[PDB]
Structure 1
Amino acid sequence: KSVLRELVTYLLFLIVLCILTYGMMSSNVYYYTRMMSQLFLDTPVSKTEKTNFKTLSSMEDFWKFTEGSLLDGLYWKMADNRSFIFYENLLLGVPRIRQLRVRNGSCSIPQDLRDEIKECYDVYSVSSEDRAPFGPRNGTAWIYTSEKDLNGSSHWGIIATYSGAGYYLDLSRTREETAAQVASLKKNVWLDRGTRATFIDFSVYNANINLFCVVRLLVEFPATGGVIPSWQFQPLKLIRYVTTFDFFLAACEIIFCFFIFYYVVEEILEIRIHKLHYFRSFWNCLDVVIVVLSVVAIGINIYRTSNVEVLLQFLEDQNTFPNFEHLAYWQIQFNNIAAVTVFFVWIKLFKFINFNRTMSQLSTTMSRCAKDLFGFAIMFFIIFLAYAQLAYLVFGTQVDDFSTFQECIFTQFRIILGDINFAEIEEANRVLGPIYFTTFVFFMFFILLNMFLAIINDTYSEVKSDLAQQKAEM
């Protein structure tokens, strides 16, 4: 029939998509980020200490790390020569440090307690930010600079979402000047009880391959006390057209755009002429989902690739901090969208695997049992969320694995796999601890897991029986 045309077009589209995904997911750049991370994250803060960035504990540990492993990993010795981190990775410009803090007096205390305590600082919020000079007010490290003046944006850290403003300092190109600047910052105390977040940003090039790398390290100081570190190493490609494979990838991208336009036109024409319902098929909703995701990806790529003005601005003055955070954010978004799109395109292959009596009856069984599976899955998920909310309310303050609701869901999903530690859950509560685990495992593996099998087996049996009886009695 006409399925041959659709199969050929879909195969060509899949080949183009696979070529594009193989091109974007290049050769081993895993080792690039691996070496960078192990250089900066796994290195102990000092020759005598055993703590690294991943296991920071207090603010003094942060100060030891700043004038320490960071300076060792940033400047490599080989008029004011530049720094090659592995004798290949070139440090672009200078790194930048930034601080976000709240103001004293953003915090209300009971009137009967205003005798022994005077100072309390609220949690981070845009309304309670501090926008006043402090300490020896000389430069940009003691003066508030707006988000617009810093060309910054939000971050969405772990505790909260942080603004793009704060008190910032641009370091130097040599180690001695940066060490002097950090010592001056530390001597005139810069991280007091009012601070709430600290960012460190820089970038490298690694001219051997054509792949920039952007590094951002964040440290959060919650109001309750402690230190929470996080990191981000992101590789980008901003000088794409260099080799022949780049031109091949560009041609493939143009072909992909043509394919997407053809699919959009076909979808519009085939929904407009007739079939006004069009949505009781599940093979037309998947098509529009794929089209929407691909159009979003194309728009993101078009809007991102044209905003390379930061590279041009940096290349004409190489003594300033280059702003590459927006490009990294949009690259991450594009990667997520492309991954989801390719997953759905691969899923779309089920429409064409019907070529013998064996493969047709399996599809018929799945389509017939989908309704019952959904009906039972509603109840299964209701019971699952009841377990999750009970665990969150009971163990959510002592176990480090039930601290958030989604973490409770993931913890139960891991309990199903058996990847859990029973020792921690029982010591949080001697009673109701073993009861929770026991009843969860029992009612999950003995009851809920078997109803799915019952439904699937009954549907498959009835489908095969009726098909065989009507086929053999014709």
Structure 2
Amino acid sequence: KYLKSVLRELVTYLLFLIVLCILTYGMMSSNVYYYTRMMSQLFLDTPVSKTEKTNFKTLSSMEDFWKFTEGSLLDGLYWKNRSFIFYENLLLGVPRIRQLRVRNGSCSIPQDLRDEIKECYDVYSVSSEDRAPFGPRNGTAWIYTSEKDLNGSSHWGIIATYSGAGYYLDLSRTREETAAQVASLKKNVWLDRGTRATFIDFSVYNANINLFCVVRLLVEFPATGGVIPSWQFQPLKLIRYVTTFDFFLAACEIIFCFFIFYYVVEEILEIRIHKLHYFRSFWNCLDVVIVVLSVVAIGINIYRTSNVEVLLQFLEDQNTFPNFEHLAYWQIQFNNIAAVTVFFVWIKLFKFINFNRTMSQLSTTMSRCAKDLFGFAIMFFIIFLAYAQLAYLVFGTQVDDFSTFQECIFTQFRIILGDINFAEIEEANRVLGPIYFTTFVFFMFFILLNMFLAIINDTYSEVKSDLAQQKAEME
């Protein structure tokens, strides 16, 4: 009856919306932000020593990493048995420090000046990484351990994608022995010119709110010299069913599964029946995306929470290193998928707001100028990329704002907002910087950005005019 169905598919969508909002409410609280912030400030902002001013975020050489390790790191891990980091956060297990390094004589120095250059170390690669015992081959810090025997995985840092193997060492449960171990590592040189990456991992609990937190710190030593630091703090949660609210959340997850099954059944019925060119409109290609993303999210959630063997293995013997990195990675992926699904589900609401004429004309205007905007956007973005590649090839060596193609695109978007100001392109090139900036601003503010408004305004005017004409004549 076109009224017993539109109202039928609207109440189901509304109930889906309340269920989704409830489900996403409990996964974001206000304790998580401060929990992360306190640890971040403790480990990243503390200067390496009472006399220096550099911190982990501004490391500059391999001699500052050694100050940080026996320094601001040990001050922030062992708090006066056990070690409660803020008298509340339990340092569970043992922190671990691992090194990835490449073998000597991996590259190929040229024949002529071979008299001066004695060795070279190639950039990091799985084919060119060292696997031999170096230095005083004594324990596990001087013996290569395979990735399988170490229960590791790739990381995808900044310079490259490092593997899960290398030379590792587990620190101690108290500061007195950890400092001695670090000093022993420093004496018998451990970070030579052949090292490429260094990882530090640990975790905390904070029993006040049932919420773990895994911490990873990376330092990358590129083959061209220098130091690049990176960090990651992830608030996991692995002991979910403790509170009645958590049982309510589990029920909500089950009900969400039921809606997703109902929606996939409805989609298959509507594809089988009465047409097979379903993928020709826009509101039909949005339901498929929603169900596919929801299925992927459900699969990820089932796969991630069904293997908590690492937590049980840690709870058996609590002197080991708690390996909670895979769980953190999967939590990040699940968060991304859930956020995108929620955004698209909220976008789906436009399918129902056509309840009167003033909304119907707006929808018609929006769906009638898409053909012209898509045609003009091709030209606009061809010119955009033409500017971006030129900026990348000219300024991309010595600005750091155009250092990569993505950075060029984002910088050119920020110029549109009036956020980037010419201070670096001058010192980079005092002659071509001004030309590039002036020409870009002129041809993408005064000319090319106002051709969207002309199209939109004319389309709105013509739609309103002919709709009114049709109304007057027919009725």
Shorter-chain TM-score: what band?
over 0.9
Residue deviations 1:85-122, cap 9 Å, x none?
00100001000000000000101011001001111100
SS for the counterpart of 1:74 is coil
Separation of aligned partners in 2, 1:334 and 1:289: 16
Separation of aligned partners in 2, 1:309 and 1:186: 35
Task: State the Cα distance separating 1:355 from its structure 2 match.
Answer: 1.0
Task: State the Cα distance separating 1:189 from its structure 2 match.
Answer: 0.2
Task: State the Cα distance separating 1:421 from its structure 2 match.
Answer: 2.9
Residue deviations 1:49-68, cap 9 Å, x none?
00000000000000000000
- Whether 2:188 is the aligned partner of 1:188: answer yes
Which position in structure 1 is the counterpart of 2:129? Answer: 129
Residue deviations 1:95-152, cap 9 Å, x none?
0000000000101011001001111100000000000000000100000000000000
Task: State the Cα distance separating 1:458 from its structure 2 match.
Answer: 1.1
Task: State the Cα distance separating 1:389 from its structure 2 match.
Answer: 0.1
SS for the counterpart of 1:168 is strand
Separation of aligned partners in 2, 1:249 and 1:131: 48
Which position in structure 2 is the counterpart of 1:38? Answer: 41
Task: State the Cα distance separating 1:275 from its structure 2 match.
Answer: 1.3
- Higher deviation after alignment, 183-192 or 456-465: 456-465
Which position in structure 1 is the counterpart of 2:341? Answer: 341
Separation of aligned partners in 2, 1:69 and 1:182: 13
- Whether 2:389 is the aligned partner of 1:389: answer yes
Q: What is the aligned residue count?
A: 471
Task: State the Cα distance separating 1:473 from its structure 2 match.
Answer: 1.8
Separation of aligned partners in 2, 1:115 and 1:373: 64
Task: State the Cα distance separating 1:273 from its structure 2 match.
Answer: 2.1
SS for the counterpart of 1:236 is coil
1:119-198 to 2 correspondence within 5 Å?
Answer: 119-198=119-198
Separation of aligned partners in 2, 1:149 and 1:274: 57
Separation of aligned partners in 2, 1:362 and 1:160: 49
Separation of aligned partners in 1, 2:418 and 2:399: 17
Separation of aligned partners in 2, 1:308 and 1:27: 26
Separation of aligned partners in 2, 1:433 and 1:276: 55
Which position in structure 1 is the counterpart of 2:452? Answer: 452
Task: State the Cα distance separating 1:270 from its structure 2 match.
Answer: 1.0
Separation of aligned partners in 1, 2:113 and 2:17: 69
Task: State the Cα distance separating 1:423 from its structure 2 match.
Answer: 1.2
Alignment TM-score, normalising by the size of structure 2? 0.99
- Whether 2:246 is the aligned partner of 1:243: answer no
Residue deviations 1:349-378, cap 9 Å, x none?
101111111111000001000111011001
Separation of aligned partners in 2, 1:425 and 1:165: 42
Which position in structure 2 is the counterpart of 1:56? Answer: 59
SS for the counterpart of 1:202 is strand
Task: State the Cα distance separating 1:27 from its structure 2 match.
Answer: 3.2
Separation of aligned partners in 1, 2:31 and 2:310: 27
Separation of aligned partners in 2, 1:391 and 1:159: 22
Residue deviations 1:291-338, cap 9 Å, x none?
000000000000000010100000010000010000000000000000
Which position in structure 1 is the counterpart of 2:370? Answer: 370
Separation of aligned partners in 2, 1:19 and 1:236: 20
SS for the counterpart of 2:31 is coil
SS for the counterpart of 1:67 is helix
Task: State the Cα distance separating 1:274 from its structure 2 match.
Answer: 2.6
Task: State the Cα distance separating 1:426 from its structure 2 match.
Answer: 1.3
SS for the counterpart of 2:85 is coil
Task: State the Cα distance separating 1:254 from its structure 2 match.
Answer: 0.2
Which position in structure 1 is the counterpart of 2:72? Answer: 69
Task: State the Cα distance separating 1:211 from its structure 2 match.
Answer: 0.3
Residue deviations 1:246-288, cap 9 Å, x none?
0000000000000000000000111012310001111011000
Separation of aligned partners in 1, 2:380 and 2:235: 42
SS for the counterpart of 1:181 is helix
Task: State the Cα distance separating 1:205 from its structure 2 match.
Answer: 0.2
Separation of aligned partners in 2, 1:472 and 1:49: 80
Residue deviations 1:138-190, cap 9 Å, x none?
10000000000000000000000000000000001000000000000000000
Task: State the Cα distance separating 1:28 from its structure 2 match.
Answer: 2.6
SS for the counterpart of 1:24 is coil
Alignment TM-score, normalising by the size of structure 1? 0.99
Residue deviations 1:229-249, cap 9 Å, x none?
000000011000000000000
Give the root-mean-square deviation of aligned CA atoms: 0.6
Separation of aligned partners in 2, 1:59 and 1:118: 21
Separation of aligned partners in 2, 1:27 and 1:248: 19
Task: State the Cα distance separating 1:419 from its structure 2 match.
Answer: 1.1
Identity of aligned residues (%): 100
Residue deviations 1:390-409, cap 9 Å, x none?
00000000101101000000
Which position in structure 2 is the counterpart of 1:24? Answer: 27
SS for the counterpart of 2:117 is coil
Task: State the Cα distance separating 1:450 from its structure 2 match.
Answer: 1.1
Which position in structure 2 is the counterpart of 1:109? Answer: 109
SS for the counterpart of 1:230 is strand
SS for the counterpart of 1:3 is coil
Separation of aligned partners in 2, 1:167 and 1:212: 27
Residue deviations 1:22-66, cap 9 Å, x none?
011123310000000000000000000000000000000000000
SS for the counterpart of 2:191 is coil
Q: Which runs of 5+ in 2 are unaligned?
A: none
- Whether 2:325 is the aligned partner of 1:325: answer yes
SS for the counterpart of 1:140 is coil
Task: State the Cα distance separating 1:19 from its structure 2 match.
Answer: 0.4
Residue deviations 1:377-396, cap 9 Å, x none?
01111000000000000000
- Higher deviation after alignment, 352-361 or 63-72: 352-361
Q: In 2 relative to 1, CA 244–27 (structure 1 residues): closer, same or farther, beyond 3 Å?
A: farther
